Amino acid sequence: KLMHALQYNSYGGGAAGLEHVQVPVPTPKSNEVCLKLEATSLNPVDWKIQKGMIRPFLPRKFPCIPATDVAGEVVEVGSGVKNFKAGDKVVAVLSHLGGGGLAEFAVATEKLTVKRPQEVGAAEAAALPVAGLTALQALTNPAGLKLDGTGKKANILVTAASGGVGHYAVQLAKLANAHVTATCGARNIEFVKSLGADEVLDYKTPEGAALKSPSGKKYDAVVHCANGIPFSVFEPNLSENGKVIDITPGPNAMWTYAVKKITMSKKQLVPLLLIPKAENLEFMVNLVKEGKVKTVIDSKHPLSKAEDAWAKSIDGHATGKIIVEP
Incomplete structure (x- = not known):
């Protein structure tokens, strides 16, 4: 029914402008899957959009729930979904139009969702996409x-x-x-x-x-x-x-x-x-699994303190990738 998330409803807020909110759990469309999030990764784009630097293209509408790089467990699939079932662990890329990353649940298209092997952690995987x-x-x-x-x-x-x-x-x-x-x-x-x-x-x-x-x-x-x-x-x-x-x-x-x-x-x-093409995400995930590529994580923050991660991203002294977990 409802869900913890972070929103900004305005340009220029910075981390101050983020708000913790409870929001309805999204529902997957024909081709989408719904994920219980285990890890979300920030990208500089995410706070730039909020500063207004990506106007007039983004954000599409306020309020926005930030972040696109995501890893978690499939909770529910849409009617058209063939390759994923509930319980599957995945890494995925959320639409850059709708965001959704800073939340307990997100919907991803099947075409941008990849099965996450046992060997690769959720934080390690979520850092990969963008x-x-x-x-x-x-x-x-x-x-x-x-x-x-x-x-x-x-x-x-x-x-x-x-x-x-x-x-x-x-x-x-x-x-x-x-x-x-x-x-x-x-x-x-x-x-x-x-x-x-x-x-x-x-x-x-x-x-x-x-x-x-x-x-x-x-x-x-x-x-x-x-x-x-x-x-x-x-x-x-x-x-x-x-x-x-x-x-x-x-x-x-x-x-x-x-x-x-x-x-x-x-x-x-x-x-x-x-x-972003799913073939490439699959590829990168394999490289991490096989140890040929390692994800370095700058920091891990709980969703309850996500503004900290946001501000860290805005400072941009991060080494590797900033992660938000539940």
């Missing part, structure tokens, strides 16, 4: 690396590699047999080395502010997860046809993309929008 698939898409599509053994070997730069997409990106890039150069805060330099990065740079230094690799590497692709960097700084560090992949693209990135396209610049800036 961050992991983004990292995966960037390295698979624009960077053009296979992740078996048949991919192009290459030089990869990962900016802000201590964060959500960042720390997945480094691990994945290593599985594609790439040389990985990474940037992060001084504190996280040892951590990023442990993800498999070949070179790690303190971004406040001179070689890291300029993104110059000690081997003198030029990068074939950049999984760009940081924010304050103009194409100027990337350019001299790029290979002849290097692509900087902005996984959090603003108007600046969008414009640069247009200009570099229309002037046929050999060096390119690629805005990335994630297209």
Whole structure:
């Protein structure tokens, strides 16, 4: 019947603007499944939407229940659901239109729900969807690396590699047999080395502010997860046809993309929008199961204290992924 959740009913609230509320448990449609949530993961998008930065596209209507990355147990399925039964443990991606993550229950489409193996925890799994698939898409599509053994070997730069997409990106890039150069805060330099990065740079230094690799590497692709960097700084560090992949693209990135396209610049800036596909989520889940990829969890917060997790996300000093559990 009813359900604990967190809502914002207005732009600009910050964590203060979140409200604990009791709300009717959603009902699954033909193709949806209903989950008792075991873990929910935050993404920077989630608090940006609330700040109003994604207007006029999101949020669709107030009030909003935030977060899309989710793991839990199937409680109930819709008439059309073929592949999941009640009791099944899953990981899923909620619609970016309706949100729903910060709650006891959520409905997910079957096409974005994946069975979660016994080996993989709920928090470990819930951290995967947006961050992991983004990292995966960037390295698979624009960077053009296979992740078996048949991919192009290459030089990869990962900016802000201590964060959500960042720390997945480094691990994945290593599985594609790439040389990985990474940037992060001084504190996280040892951590990023442990993800498999070949070179790690303190971004406040001179070689890291300029993104110059000690081997003198030029990068074939950049999984760009940081924010304050103009194409100027990337350019001299790029290979002849290097692509900087902005996984959090603003108007600046969008414009640069247009200009570099229309002037046929050999060096390119690629805005990335994630297209979550269940095959990829299944894939990432397997990588975690097989130990080829580890999820690092910055912190775990109870839904009753979810604003803390929200504020931690807003500060964005998180290392890996922030998790909210019941």
